[PDB]
Short mmCIF file of C-alpha atoms in Angstrom, two decimals:
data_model
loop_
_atom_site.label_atom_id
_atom_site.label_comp_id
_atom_site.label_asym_id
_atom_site.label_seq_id
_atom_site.Cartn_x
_atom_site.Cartn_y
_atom_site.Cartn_z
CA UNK P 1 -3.94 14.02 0.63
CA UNK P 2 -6.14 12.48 3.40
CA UNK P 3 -8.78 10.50 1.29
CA UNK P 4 -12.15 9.80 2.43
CA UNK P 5 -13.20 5.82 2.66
CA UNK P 6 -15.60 5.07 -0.53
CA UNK P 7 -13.53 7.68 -2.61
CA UNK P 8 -10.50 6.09 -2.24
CA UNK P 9 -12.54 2.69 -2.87
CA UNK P 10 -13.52 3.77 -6.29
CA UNK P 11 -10.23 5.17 -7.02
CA UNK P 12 -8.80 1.63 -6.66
CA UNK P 13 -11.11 -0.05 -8.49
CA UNK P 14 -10.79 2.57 -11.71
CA UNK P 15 -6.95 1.76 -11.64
CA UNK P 16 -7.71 -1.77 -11.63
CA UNK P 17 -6.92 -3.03 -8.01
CA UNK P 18 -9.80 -5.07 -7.74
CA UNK P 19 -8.88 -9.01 -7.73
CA UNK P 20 -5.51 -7.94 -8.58
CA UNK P 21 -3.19 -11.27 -7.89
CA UNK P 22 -6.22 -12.53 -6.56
CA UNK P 23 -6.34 -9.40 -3.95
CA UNK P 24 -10.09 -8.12 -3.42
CA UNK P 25 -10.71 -4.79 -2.80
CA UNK P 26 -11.66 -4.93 0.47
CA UNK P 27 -8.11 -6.00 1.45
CA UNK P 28 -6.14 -3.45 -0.26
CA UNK P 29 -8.35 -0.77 1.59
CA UNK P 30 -8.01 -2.97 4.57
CA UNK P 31 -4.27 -2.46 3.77
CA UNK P 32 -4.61 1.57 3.26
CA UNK P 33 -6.25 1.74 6.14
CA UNK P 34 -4.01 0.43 8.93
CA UNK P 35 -1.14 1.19 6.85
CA UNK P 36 -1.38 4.79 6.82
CA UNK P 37 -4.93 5.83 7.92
CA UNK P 38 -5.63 6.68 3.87
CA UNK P 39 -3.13 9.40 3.86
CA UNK P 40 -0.55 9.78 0.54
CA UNK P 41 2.05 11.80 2.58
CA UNK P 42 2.75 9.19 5.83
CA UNK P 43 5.96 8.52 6.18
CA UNK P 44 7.76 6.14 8.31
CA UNK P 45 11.54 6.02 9.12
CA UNK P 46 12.98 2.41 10.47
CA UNK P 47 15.43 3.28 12.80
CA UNK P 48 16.35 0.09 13.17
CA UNK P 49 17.76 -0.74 9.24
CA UNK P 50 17.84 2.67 8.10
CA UNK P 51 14.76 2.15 5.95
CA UNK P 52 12.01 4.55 5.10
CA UNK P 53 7.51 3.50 4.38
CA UNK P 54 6.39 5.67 1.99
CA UNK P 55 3.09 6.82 0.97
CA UNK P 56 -0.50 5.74 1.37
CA UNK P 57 0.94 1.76 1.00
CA UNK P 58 3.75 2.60 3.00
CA UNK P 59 5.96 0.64 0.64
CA UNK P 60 9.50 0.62 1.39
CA UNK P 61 12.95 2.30 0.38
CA UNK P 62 14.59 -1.31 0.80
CA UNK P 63 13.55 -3.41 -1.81
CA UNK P 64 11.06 -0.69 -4.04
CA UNK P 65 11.48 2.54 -4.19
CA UNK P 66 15.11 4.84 -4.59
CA UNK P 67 14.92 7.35 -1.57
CA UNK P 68 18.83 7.32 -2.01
CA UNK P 69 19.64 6.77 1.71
CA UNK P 70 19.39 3.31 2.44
CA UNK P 71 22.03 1.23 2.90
CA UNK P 72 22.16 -1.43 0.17
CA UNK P 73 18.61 -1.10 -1.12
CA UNK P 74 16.86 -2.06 -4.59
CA UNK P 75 14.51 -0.39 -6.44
CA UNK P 76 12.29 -2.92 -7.95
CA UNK P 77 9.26 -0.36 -8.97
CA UNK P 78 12.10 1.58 -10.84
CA UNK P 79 11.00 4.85 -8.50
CA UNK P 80 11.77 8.25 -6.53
CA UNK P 81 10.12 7.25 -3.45
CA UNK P 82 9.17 10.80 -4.15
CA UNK P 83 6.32 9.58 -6.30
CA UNK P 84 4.45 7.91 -3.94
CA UNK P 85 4.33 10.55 -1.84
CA UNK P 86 1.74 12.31 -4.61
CA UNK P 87 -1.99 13.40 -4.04
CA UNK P 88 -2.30 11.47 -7.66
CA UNK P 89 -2.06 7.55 -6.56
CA UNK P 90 -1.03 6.07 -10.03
CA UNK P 91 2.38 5.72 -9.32
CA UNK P 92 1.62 4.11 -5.81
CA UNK P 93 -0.49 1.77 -7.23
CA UNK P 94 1.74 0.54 -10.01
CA UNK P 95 4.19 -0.01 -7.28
CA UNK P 96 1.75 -1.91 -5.35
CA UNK P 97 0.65 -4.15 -8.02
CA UNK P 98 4.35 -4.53 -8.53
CA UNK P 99 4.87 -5.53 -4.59
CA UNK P 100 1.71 -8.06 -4.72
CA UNK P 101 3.35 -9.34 -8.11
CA UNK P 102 6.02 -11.37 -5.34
CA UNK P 103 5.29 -14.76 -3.89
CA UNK P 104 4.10 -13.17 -0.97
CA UNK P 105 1.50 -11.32 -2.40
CA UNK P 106 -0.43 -9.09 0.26
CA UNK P 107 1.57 -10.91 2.85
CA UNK P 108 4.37 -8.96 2.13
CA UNK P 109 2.92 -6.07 4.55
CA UNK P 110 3.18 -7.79 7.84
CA UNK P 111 0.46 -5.15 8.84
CA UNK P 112 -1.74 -7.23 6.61
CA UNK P 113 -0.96 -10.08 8.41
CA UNK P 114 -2.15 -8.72 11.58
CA UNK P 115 -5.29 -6.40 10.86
CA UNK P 116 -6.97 -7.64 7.95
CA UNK P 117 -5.84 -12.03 7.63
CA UNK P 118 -9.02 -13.95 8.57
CA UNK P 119 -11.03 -10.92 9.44
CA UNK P 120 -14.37 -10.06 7.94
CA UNK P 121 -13.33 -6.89 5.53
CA UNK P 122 -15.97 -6.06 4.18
CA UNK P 123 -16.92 -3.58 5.91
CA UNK P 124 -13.68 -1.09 4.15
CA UNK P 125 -15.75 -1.19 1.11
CA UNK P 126 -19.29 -0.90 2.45
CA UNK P 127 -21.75 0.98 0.79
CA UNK P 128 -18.95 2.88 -1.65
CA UNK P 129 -20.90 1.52 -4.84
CA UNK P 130 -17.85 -0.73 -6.10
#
C-alpha cells in the first residue's frame, strides 16, 4: 500500500509514534518518506552483506527482522520480515519503536542522517490535523 501524506500522519500518531524516544512526528514521516516514498511493500536487497530493507521503514533482515537468508543475522523485533511487508502498519511500527528503543535512536537509519538531521520537517506533517 502506497499511503497518501496526512493519512499516513494520523496513522502514526493513533499508534502512538508521536514523541516516541523523544522522536516527533515530523521525523518519522521525514523517515517514511525518503525511506521508501510511503510505500509498505519496498524492498531493498544489499548486495553487498547479503541483507534485505523491508517495508515502509525499510528496517533490516540483519539485526530485526527473520527473512531466513542472511548470513548471521538477529531478530530483535522477534519477526517474519514478512510482516512488515503488510498494508496494516502495526507490526512495522512495533518494530520501529523497537529500532528507536537503541542508543541510536532515529540515527540508526543513516537515511535519517542525511535527509531529515538539521532540516526544517515540518513541512511532512503540514496541514494533516495531528
Amino acid at each position: 500500500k502506497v499511503f497518501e501524506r496526512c493519512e499516513l500522519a494520523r496513522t502514526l500518531k493513533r499508534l502512538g509514534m508521536d514523541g516516541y524516544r523523544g522522536i516527533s512526528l515530523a521525523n518519522w514521516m521525514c523517515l517514511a518518506k525518503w525511506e521508501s516514498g510511503y510505500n509498505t511493500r519496498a524492498t531493498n536487497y544489499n548486495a553487498g552483506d547479503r541483507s534485505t530493507d523491508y517495508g515502509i521503514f525499510q528496517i533490516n533482515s540483519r539485526y530485526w527482522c527473520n527473512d531466513g537468508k542472511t548470513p548471521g543475522a538477529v531478530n530483535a523485533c522477534h519477526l517474519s520480515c514478512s510482516a512488515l511487508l503488510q498494508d496494516n502498519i502495526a507490526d512495522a511500527v512495533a518494530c520501529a519503536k523497537r529500532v528507536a528503543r537503541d542508543p541510536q535512536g532515529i540515527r540508526a537509519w543513516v537515511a535519517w542522517r542525511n535527509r531529515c538531521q538539521n532540516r526544517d520537517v515540518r513541512q511532512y506533517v503540514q496541514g494533516c490535523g495531528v
